[PDB]
């Protein structure tokens, strides 16, 4: 989940 946030942004 954390990585998905960083990736998205
Ligand atoms: Ag991305
Ligand atoms: Ag990415
Ligand atoms: Ag990604």
Give residue 2 CA to ligand 3 midpoint distance, Å: 11
Give residue 2 CA to ligand 1 midpoint distance, Å: 12
Helix, strand or coil, per DSSP, at residue 1: coil
Give residue 5 CA to ligand 1 midpoint distance, Å: 8
Method in brief: X-ray
Q: How many helices (H) and strands (E) does the chain have?
A: 1, 0
Give residue 8 CA to ligand 2 midpoint distance, Å: 6
Q: After which residues is the chain broken (C to N over 2.5 A)?
A: none
Give residue 9 CA to ligand 1 midpoint distance, Å: 7
Neighbours of 5 (CB within 10 A): 8
């Amino acid at each position: 989940l954390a990585a998905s946030l960083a990736c998205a942004l």
